[PDB]
Scaffold this active site. Structure first.
Site, short mmCIF file in Angstrom:
data_model
loop_
_atom_site.label_atom_id
_atom_site.label_comp_id
_atom_site.label_asym_id
_atom_site.label_seq_id
_atom_site.Cartn_x
_atom_site.Cartn_y
_atom_site.Cartn_z
CG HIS A 47 138.98 83.69 24.85
ND1 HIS A 47 139.87 82.86 24.19
CD2 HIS A 47 138.13 82.87 25.52
CE1 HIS A 47 139.55 81.64 24.43
NE2 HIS A 47 138.49 81.60 25.26
CG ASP A 89 136.22 78.54 26.28
OD1 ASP A 89 137.21 79.33 26.19
OD2 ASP A 89 136.33 77.29 26.42
#
Length: 122
Positions: A47, A89
């Protein structure tokens, strides 16, 4: 922004996001990246690497539109950098859910300076 990200994490995992992922392992939350400790931590590494493409927007502050519908995250009608942020996300929240069965409570509040430098490019 952190607000959309946290909501997605809560929606996917049922876990309070800051408690569970604000300081987990070598990559989740505060701090930077390091060699991951486990699958959850790898989600967090990926991420933060995903966020490197965001040249025109701020991953922490900038708000974006998405919907939680039918157990799916659907990124909305966003400007290009904000859509990239949303999609980073989304993937992360899904990854965290996928790895709940190895979430290690001992890693929840982790000594990040003890982490090892990664040899992996994003």
């Amino acid at each position: 922004s952190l607000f959309e990200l946290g909501k997605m994490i809560w929606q996917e995992t049922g876990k309070n996001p800051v408690k569970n992922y604000g300081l987990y392992g070598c990559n989740c939350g505060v701090g930077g990246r390091g060699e991951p400790l486990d699958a959850t931590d790898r989600c967090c590494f990926v991420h933060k690497c995903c966020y490197k493409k965001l040249t025109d927007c701020d991953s922490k502050k900038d708000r974006y539109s998405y919907k939680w519908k039918n157990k799916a995250i659907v990124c909305g009608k966003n400007q290009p950098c904000m859509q990239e942020m949303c999609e980073c996300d989304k993937a992360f929240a899904i990854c965290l859910r996928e790895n709940l069965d190895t979430y290690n409570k001992s890693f929840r509040y982790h000594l990040k300076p003890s982490c090892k430098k990664t040899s992996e490019q994003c």
